[PDB]
Amino acid sequence: MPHAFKPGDLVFAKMKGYPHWPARIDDIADGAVKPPPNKYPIFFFGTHETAFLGPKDLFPYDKSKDKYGKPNKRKGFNEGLWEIQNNPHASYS
Q: Regarding the domain delimited by 10-86, which CATH topology (the fold level of the hierarchy) does it fall under?
């Protein structure tokens, strides 16, 4: 049975106006800005951007990849598909 989200988990993350996007739950570094309550820091592969999202917008990658893991015309998306498949836990800073 599933647990709550934790840093390192792999997802597709949904933002209004954007396709379900390859992403991870990030950690928060000592001294760094924390998310709002009930929100997680989401690192988007390919764009390397961060947004704060709740579980309603987070789809676990294993379950969802057959639906959402297909190329897309949007900037960064296909690089993001490579990252989540090939090195999802690397530093992209």
A: SH3 type barrels. (2.30.30)
